[PDB]
Each structure stands twice: as structure tokens, then as C-alpha cells.
Design a protein around this ligand. Structure first.
Ligand SMILES: CCCCCCCC/C=C\CCCCCCCC(=O)OC[C@H](COP(=O)(O)OCC[N+](C)(C)C)OC(=O)CCCCCCC/C=C\CCCCCCCC
Ligand SMILES: CCCCCCCC/C=C\CCCCCCCC(=O)OC[C@H](COP(=O)(O)OCC[N+](C)(C)C)OC(=O)CCCCCCC/C=C\CCCCCCCC
Ligand SMILES: CCCCCCCC/C=C\CCCCCCCC(=O)OC[C@H](COP(=O)(O)OCC[N+](C)(C)C)OC(=O)CCCCCCC/C=C\CCCCCCCC
Ligand SMILES: CCCCCCCC/C=C\CCCCCCCC(=O)OC[C@H](COP(=O)(O)OCC[N+](C)(C)C)OC(=O)CCCCCCC/C=C\CCCCCCCC
Ligand SMILES: CCCCCCCC/C=C\CCCCCCCC(=O)OC[C@H](COP(=O)(O)OCC[N+](C)(C)C)OC(=O)CCCCCCC/C=C\CCCCCCCC
Ligand SMILES: CCCCCCCC/C=C\CCCCCCCC(=O)OC[C@H](COP(=O)(O)OCC[N+](C)(C)C)OC(=O)CCCCCCC/C=C\CCCCCCCC
Ligand SMILES: CCCCCCCC/C=C\CCCCCCCC(=O)OC[C@H](COP(=O)(O)OCC[N+](C)(C)C)OC(=O)CCCCCCC/C=C\CCCCCCCC
Ligand SMILES: CCCCCCCC/C=C\CCCCCCCC(=O)OC[C@H](COP(=O)(O)OCC[N+](C)(C)C)OC(=O)CCCCCCC/C=C\CCCCCCCC
Ligand SMILES: CCCCCCCC/C=C\CCCCCCCC(=O)OC[C@H](COP(=O)(O)OC[C@H](N)C(=O)O)OC(=O)CCCCCCC/C=C\CCCCCCCC
Ligand SMILES: CCCCCCCC/C=C\CCCCCCCC(=O)OC[C@H](COP(=O)(O)OC[C@H](N)C(=O)O)OC(=O)CCCCCCC/C=C\CCCCCCCC
Ligand SMILES: CCCCCCCC/C=C\CCCCCCCC(=O)OC[C@H](COP(=O)(O)OC[C@H](N)C(=O)O)OC(=O)CCCCCCC/C=C\CCCCCCCC
Lengths: 198, 198
């Protein structure tokens, strides 16, 4: 109700901020000029010296890079041949290994898979008989269980309806009057609430 | 009484559930025993035949595995010798390109650092001069900034006091009736909740 009075105080403080902003921006600009000019003299000296520092530094670096690269062509380059030759010999050594051991490993695999043909295959065949027996039990007990499920389902169904019938009646017989009473407690609440917050 | 009555219906449900649970456990276990019975009979195959066949199965694999290892041992020796002799030459060659080329690299590194030091000497010298120049500027300007900021803070405090005394007093005065009305609202709300919830 006193919003206008409260907003006035805020308008006053806002105006107070404006009272400060005036001289504040004035001195801020003066300070900015001081800083910019201060950094300006530093920048001129920095930039000027940079030309006399980066250039000789680049030259120094270029010389080092030249030596570095030269040394690389006198090391990495010739060593590339030494390493390549070593790699070639290594590859040759590997060839003389990947061939006998390669065929040997393949023969090992042959002996492995071949064994599996007389190991896994005949075993899965035996398992087929066992699976048939297991599945038979699953079908036998399962079929019986299906009847049990149906029986218990119908039994439980009778029990469920035996509860649903009276429960719903009782629930309705209780919810109806309770709802009416609830409406009363709601009406009194809503009416009073709207008056308190009016 | 709603909770008691509603619970009563649930209680009777538990009775019927338990009464049905009996036949359930009986039937389930009866069939489960048949499942296990099958597995018990199957055990004379699934676990018995597997332990019987595991003999030639493992004996075959173990036999071939022995050869597999013996072959690897028959190769490990000549291959290790090839690797040893090869590594000898490969590493020896690297040494011939590690000692002289290393000393050369170290020699070039001497100049690498020497040139850098020779360049860093005047650089660091002028860096200290740059720092002095910058520090002096930042000190002159800094002192001015501090004085100005101090004055700024002083003025800000004067206007801040407008928010600490007049504005705050105004706010307090405005909050007084606010608390007064809020008290009534809280009190009535407390009663409202008690009147309808109790
Ligand atoms: C153009 C405009 C003007 C100029 C502008 C640029 C100015 C630049 C001037 C200076 C910049 C310096 C920057 C670095 C400052 C800190 C240097 C430092 O304090 O270093 C300390 C280390 C300490 O070693 P320690 O024996 O105490 O520890 C031994 C530990 N334990 C037991 C393994 C082996 O000593 C070292 O780093 C040095 C020895 C190790 C060197 C490793 C390889 C470096 C690679 C190339 C050489 C680079 C030379 C330039 C500096 C490169 C830095 C990466
Ligand atoms: C003209 C100027 C030429 C400048 C040439 C500079 C290089 C010169 C060549 C060699 C000498 C300088 C080497 C400088 C770099 C290595 C510096 C170094 O001394 O490092 C040592 C650390 C040791 O660690 P630590 O765990 O043993 O001990 C600490 C951890 N603690 C606690 C658990 C033990 O590290 C190690 O020793 C492991 C090092 C593994 C190998 C690193 C090789 C780096 C070389 C090049 C990398 C370039 C990357 C470029 C990326 C951008 C591409 C565009
Ligand atoms: C001791 C206390 C223990 C706890 C007791 C808890 C008692 C709870 C009592 C009552 C249940 C209250 C919650 C009921 C929720 C709704 C149930 C229902 O009535 O939802 C029917 C719809 C029928 O389809 P509609 O297209 O008309 O969708 C209608 C929905 N609308 C809009 C979005 C398309 O359902 C659907 O829509 C989607 C599903 C359709 C049927 C899927 C059947 C799946 C097959 C087998 C699942 C068997 C689960 C058995 C769980 C145990 C049971 C004993
Ligand atoms: C409309 C129809 C909706 C569907 C209705 C379904 C009704 C049937 C299903 C569930 C009804 C459960 C009724 C439970 C009544 C109370 C039983 C009870 O005695 O409450 C208390 C007990 C003990 O206290 P506590 O253990 O809770 O805490 C102990 C805390 N401390 C250790 C401090 C000791 O609670 C216990 O005994 C823990 C009992 C846990 C029982 C879990 C369920 C078991 C049933 C089947 C499991 C799967 C079997 C088949 C698996 C096939 C695999 C292939
Ligand atoms: C649900 C979301 C996650 C699903 C994860 C699994 C996904 C894949 C499906 C099934 C895998 C289940 C893996 C876990 C199985 C249960 C493990 C377990 O921790 O169980 C514990 C219970 C309780 O005793 P405990 O050992 O914990 O505590 C006393 C002993 N202590 C000291 C050492 C603790 O064990 C018992 O209650 C008694 C157990 C008796 C077992 C007899 C087995 C006889 C052999 C064959 C029978 C027929 C099997 C047919 C195939 C069945 C496939 C499931
Ligand atoms: C119905 C007929 C069926 C017939 C079936 C036939 C095939 C059956 C299949 C397997 C049977 C295996 C039987 C093994 C019997 C020996 C077990 C054993 O004694 O073995 C001991 C070792 C070492 O034991 P130690 O060092 O303590 O003693 C060492 C003592 N000394 C030094 C003398 C070295 O241990 C081991 O062999 C354990 C090796 C396995 C370790 C698994 C660890 C898993 C851990 C976490 C689970 C991660 C799951 C990840 C899933 C996603 C993956 C991508
Ligand atoms: C308005 C903002 C600008 C003006 C700020 C003026 C006040 C500055 C100081 C504090 C500001 C207030 C908050 C606190 C700041 C940290 C103060 C401090 O006490 O920190 C100390 C640390 C550690 O000291 P310690 O362990 O070595 O010595 C310990 C004693 N004893 C050596 C015996 C080893 O200091 C260190 O860690 C060394 C590294 C410090 C951070 C360097 C990088 C800063 C990043 C940007 C600034 C760039 C400025 C460029 C020039 C602008 C000119 C206008
Ligand atoms: C922040 C800008 C304000 C601008 C207006 C005022 C300007 C005033 C004039 C100049 C500025 C001066 C700034 C000074 C900063 C000092 C920072 C600092 O180093 O302080 C350190 C103290 C440490 O602890 P201690 O000395 O108390 O105890 C110590 C107990 N022993 C010693 C055991 C160690 O801690 C403290 O000073 C606590 C400092 C708490 C500062 C709260 C500022 C709240 C301002 C606005 C709120 C909203 C911010 C986000 C706005 C987002 C907008 C988009
Ligand atoms: C971003 C980070 C990348 C990290 C990569 C790490 C692995 C690097 C692998 C090998 C080494 C580098 C091998 C680089 C080979 C480069 C070969 C090359 O032609 O690259 C062309 C690209 C071109 O980029 P652009 O985007 O500008 O143009 C693309 C073009 N329009 C198109 O897509 O058709 O530019 C580049 O790729 C960059 C070329 C830089 C050449 C430098 C040549 C330098 C010559 C000698 C060495 C001097 C060393 C000096 C320092 C010594 C130590 C101090
Ligand atoms: C009779 C009451 C008795 C006491 C009751 C006490 C309990 C009351 C509690 C609940 C009852 C009311 C329950 C109301 C449930 C409303 C549920 C609902 O509609 O959700 C959706 C609405 C949608 O609003 P809108 O469409 O404006 O905004 C949509 C939004 N932009 C978007 O698109 O995302 O979301 C919104 O409206 C939220 C923003 C609203 C902005 C306007 C908000 C306007 C708010 C007030 C209007 C001015 C009041 C001035 C003072 C009056 C008293 C002096
Ligand atoms: C549209 C504009 C509307 C403007 C409305 C303005 C209304 C103004 C109303 C009244 C004027 C202000 C009236 C202020 C009254 C309180 C003034 C005051 O500071 O009293 C001193 C106390 C001091 O607490 P201490 O914790 O230091 O005490 C000792 C401590 N308990 C111990 O035992 O160690 O601090 C306090 O009591 C208060 C909390 C201090 C910490 C706050 C810590 C910070 C907490 C909140 C502030 C930040 C909130 C950030 C929210 C971000 C949302 C995204």
C-alpha cells in the first residue's frame, strides 16, 4: 500500500547514484587518461625496444634453428638409413619367423580346430540329447505349471473379486460422505483464505 | 477408522495369500524337485560324461600343448640368438652415432646456451630497466589512483550513509507496519491451518 513511498526512497538513492556518476565519470576519465598516457609511455618504449629485441632474437633463433636443422640432416637423416637398415634386417628376421612359425601356428590352429571337430561337435551332439531331456522337464513341469498358473489365477481371481466387490462398495460408502465432509472443510477454507488474502 | 478398516481388508488378503502360498510352495517345489531330478539324472552325463571325455580332451590338448611349447623352445633359442646378435649390431651402430654425434650435439648445445646467455645478458639487464620504468610509472600513476580512489571511497561513503541512515531509517519505518500486518496474516494463517487441518 506504501509502494509509492518505498519506491521514492529507491528513486532518491538512484538519484544519489546519479549525483556520484557525474563527478565519478569526470574523475574516471581523468584517471583513464592518466592510465592510458602512463601505459602509453610504457608502450612506446616497449614497442620500440621490441623491434630491437624480437628481430635479433629471431636472428639468434634462426641461427639456432639452422644449426638444429643442419644437425638433424647430419643425424636424423643419416640415422634414418641406419634405422631403415636395422628395420629392414628386423623385417627380414621377422619374415624368417612369420613364415615357419606362421605355418606352424596355422598347423597348430588346424590341430586345435580339428580336435574341436571331434571335441565340441560330438559334445554339442551329446548336449542335444541332454537339452531334449531338460526341455522335456521344462515342458512337463511347465505344462503342469501352466495349469497351476491357470488354476491359481482363477482361484486368486475369485479371491480378488471377493475383495473388490465389498471393498469398492465400502470404499464408495465411505468416500461419498467423506467427500461431502471434505467439501465442507474445503469451502470453509477457500472462503476464509480468500478473505485473509483479500 | 478409515485406516483401520482399509487395513482390515488388506489383512484378510494376507490370510488368503498365505493360505494359497501353501499349495504354491507345494506345487512349485514338487515341480522343482522334478527339475532337479532331471538335472540329477543328467548329472550322470552332463558332469559324468564331461569328466570322462575330459580325459582324452585334455590329454590331446596337453600333448599338443607340450609340442607347442617344445617348438617354441626350439625356436626361442635361435630366435633369441638372432635377437641378441641383431640387437648387438643395432645398438652398437647407435653407439657409434651416440658418442661422437652426442659430443657434437653437446658442443653445439654449448653454443646454443652460450648464444642465449650472451643474448639474455643484455636482455635481462634491459628487462630490469623496463621493470623499473614500468614500476615507476605504475607507482606514480598508482599513487594518483590511490589518492583518487581514496577520495572516491570517501565521497562514496558519504552517499552510502544516505542508504545507511536516511534510506535505512525510511525502510525500517516502512517495515514496521509491514511486520504489523504480516503478524496478523501469520496469526490468522496459523488459525486457518489449525481450524481446517485439525
Ligand atoms: C625478445 C624480447 C626480449 C626477450 C624476451 C624473452 C626473455 C626470456 C628470458 C628468460 C625466460 C626464462 C623462462 C624460464 C624461467 C625459469 C628457468 C628455470 O628456472 O629453469 C630451472 C631448471 C632447474 O633445473 P635443476 O637442475 O634445478 O633441476 C633438476 C631436476 N632433476 C633432478 C631432474 C633433473 O633449469 C632449467 O630449466 C634449465 C636446464 C634444463 C633445460 C631443459 C631443456 C630446455 C630446452 C631448450 C633450452 C631452452 C633455453 C631457454 C629456457 C627454456 C625453458 C624451458
Ligand atoms: C633451437 C632450440 C632447440 C631447442 C631443443 C630443445 C630440446 C633439446 C633436446 C634435448 C634436451 C632438451 C629436452 C627438453 C625437453 C625435456 C626436458 C626434461 O628434462 O624433461 C624431463 C622430465 C622428467 O620427468 P620424470 O617423471 O622423470 O621426473 C619428474 C616426475 N617425477 C616426480 C615423479 C620423477 O620428462 C622426462 O624426463 C620425459 C621426457 C620424454 C621425452 C620428451 C621429448 C621432448 C622433446 C620434444 C617434444 C616436442 C613437443 C612439441 C609439441 C608441439 C608441436 C607443434
Ligand atoms: C500389499 C500391497 C501391494 C501393492 C498393492 C497395489 C494395489 C494397486 C491398486 C490399484 C492400482 C492403482 C494404479 C492403477 C494404474 C492404472 C492401471 C490400469 O488399469 O491401466 C490400464 C491401462 C489399459 O490400457 P489403455 O490402452 O486403456 O491405457 C489406459 C491408460 N492411458 C491413459 C494413459 C492410455 O493399461 C495400459 O494402458 C498399459 C498396460 C496394458 C496391460 C499390459 C499387460 C502386460 C502384461 C503382463 C503384465 C502383468 C503384470 C502383473 C503385475 C502383478 C499383478 C498382480
Ligand atoms: C493384487 C495382488 C498383487 C500381488 C500380490 C502378491 C502377494 C504375494 C507376494 C508377496 C506378498 C508378501 C507378503 C509379505 C507379508 C509380510 C511377511 C513378513 O514376514 O514380513 C516381515 C519379514 C521379516 O522382516 P524383514 O525381512 O522385512 O526385515 C528384517 C529386518 N531385520 C533383519 C532387522 C531382521 O520380511 C521377510 O521375511 C522378507 C520377505 C521377502 C519376500 C520376497 C518375495 C518372495 C516371494 C517370491 C520370490 C521369488 C520366488 C520364486 C523365484 C523363482 C526363481 C527362478
Ligand atoms: C536382478 C538384476 C541383476 C541380475 C544379475 C544376474 C543376471 C543373470 C541372471 C542370473 C544370475 C544370478 C547371479 C547371482 C546368483 C545369486 C548369487 C548369490 O549371492 O546368492 C546368494 C544366496 C544367499 O546365500 P549367500 O551365499 O548369498 O550367503 C551365504 C553364503 N555367503 C558366505 C558366502 C554369502 O544364495 C542362496 O540363497 C542359495 C543359492 C543356492 C544355489 C544352488 C544352485 C544349484 C545348482 C543348480 C541349480 C539349478 C540352476 C538352474 C539355473 C539357475 C540360473 C539362475
Ligand atoms: C556341466 C559341465 C560343465 C563343464 C565346464 C567346463 C569348463 C569350465 C570352465 C572353467 C573352469 C575353470 C576351472 C579353474 C580351476 C582352477 C581355479 C584357480 O585356482 O585359479 C587360480 C588362479 C590364481 O589364483 P591365486 O593367484 O589366488 O593363486 C595362485 C596360486 N599359485 C601361485 C599356485 C599360482 O586364479 C584364476 O585362475 C582365476 C581366473 C579368472 C579370474 C576372473 C576374475 C573376475 C573378476 C571380476 C569379474 C570381471 C567381469 C568382467 C565382465 C566383462 C568383461 C569384458
Ligand atoms: C584491481 C586488480 C589489479 C590491481 C591489484 C592490486 C592488488 C594485488 C594484490 C592482491 C589483490 C587482492 C586479492 C589478493 C591477490 C593476491 C595477493 C597475494 O599476496 O598473492 C600472493 C601470491 C603468493 O606469493 P608468494 O608465495 O610468492 O610469497 C609469499 C611470501 N614469501 C615469498 C616470503 C614467499 O603471489 C603469487 O603467488 C605470485 C603471482 C600473483 C599473480 C600474478 C598474475 C596476476 C594476473 C594478472 C595480473 C596482471 C597485472 C599486470 C599489470 C597491471 C598494472 C595495473
Ligand atoms: C566487490 C565490489 C564492490 C564495489 C563497491 C565497493 C568499492 C569499495 C572500494 C574499493 C574496492 C575494495 C575491494 C576490496 C576487496 C578485498 C577482498 C579480500 O581480500 O577480502 C578478504 C577478506 C578475508 O577475510 P576477513 O578479512 O574477513 O577475515 C580474515 C581473518 N584472518 C586474517 C584470520 C585472515 O574477506 C573479505 O574481505 C570479504 C569481502 C566481501 C565482499 C562482498 C562484496 C559484495 C558486493 C556485491 C555483492 C554481489 C557481487 C556479485 C555481483 C554480480 C553482478 C552481475
Ligand atoms: C597445431 C599443432 C600441430 C602439432 C603437430 C605435431 C606433429 C607434427 C608432425 C610433423 C612435423 C610437422 C610437419 C608439417 C608438414 C606440413 C606440410 C604442409 O604443407 O602443411 C600445410 C598446412 C597448410 O595449412 P593451411 O590451413 O594454412 O592451408 C591448408 C590448405 N589451404 C589446404 O587445406 O589445402 O600447414 C601445415 O600443415 C603446417 C606446416 C608446418 C611446417 C613446419 C616446417 C618446419 C621446418 C623445419 C623445422 C623447423 C623447426 C624449428 C624449431 C626447432 C626446435 C627449436
Ligand atoms: C480463490 C483462491 C482461494 C485461496 C487459494 C489458496 C491456494 C492457491 C493455490 C493454488 C490455486 C491456483 C492454482 C493455479 C494452477 C495453475 C497451473 C497452470 O496454469 O500452469 C500453467 C500456467 C500458465 O500461465 P500463463 O499462460 O500466463 O503462462 C504460460 C507461460 N508463459 C508458458 O507458456 O510457459 O502457469 C502459470 O500461470 C504461472 C505464471 C502465472 C503468471 C500470472 C500470475 C498472476 C497472479 C495473480 C494475479 C494478480 C493478483 C493481484 C492480487 C489479487 C489479490 C489482491
Ligand atoms: C528490488 C530491491 C529490493 C531491496 C530490498 C532491501 C531490503 C532491505 C531490508 C533490510 C535492510 C538490511 C537489514 C540487514 C539486517 C542484518 C544486518 C547484519 O549484518 O547484522 C549482522 C549479522 C552478522 O552475522 P554473523 O554471522 O557475522 O554473526 C555471527 C555469526 N553468527 C557467528 O556466530 O559466527 O548479519 C546479519 O544479521 C544479516 C546477514 C549477514 C550475512 C549475509 C550474507 C549474504 C546473504 C544474502 C545476501 C546475498 C544474496 C544473494 C542471492 C543470489 C540469488 C541468485
Amino acid at each position: 500500500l506504501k509502494l509509492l513511498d518505498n519506491w521514492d526512497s529507491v528513486t532518491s538513492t538512484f538519484s544519489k547514484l546519479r549525483e556520484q556518476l557525474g563527478p565519478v565519470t569526470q574523475e574516471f576519465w581523468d584517471n583513464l587518461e592518466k592510465e592510458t598516457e602512463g601505459l602509453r609511455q610504457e608502450m612506446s618504449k616497449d614497442l620500440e625496444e621490441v623491434k630491437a629485441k624480437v628481430q635479433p632474437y629471431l636472428d639468434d633463433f634462426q641461427k639456432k634453428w639452422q644449426e638444429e636443422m643442419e644437425l638433424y640432416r647430419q643425424k636424423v637423416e643419416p640415422l634414418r638409413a641406419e634405422l631403415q637398415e636395422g628395420a629392414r634386417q628386423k623385417l627380414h628376421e621377422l619374415q624368417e619367423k612369420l613364415s615357419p612359425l606362421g605355418e606352424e601356428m596355422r598347423d597348430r590352429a588346424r590341430a586345435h580346430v580339428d580336435a574341436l571337430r571331434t571335441h565340441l561337435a560330438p559334445y554339442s551332439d551329446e548336449l542335444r540329447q541332454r537339452l531334449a531331456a531338460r526341455l522335456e522337464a521344462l515342458k512337463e513341469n511347465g505344462g503342469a505349471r501352466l495349469a497351476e498358473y491357470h488354476a491359481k489365477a482363477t482361484e486368486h481371481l475369485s479371491t480378488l473379486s471377493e475383495k473388490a466387490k465389498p471393498a469398492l462398495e465400502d470404499l464408495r460408502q465411505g468416500l461419498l460422505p467423506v467427500l461431502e465432509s471434505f467439501k465442507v472443510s474445503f469451502l470453509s477454507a477457500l472462503e476464509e483464505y480468500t478473505k485473509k488474502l483479500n
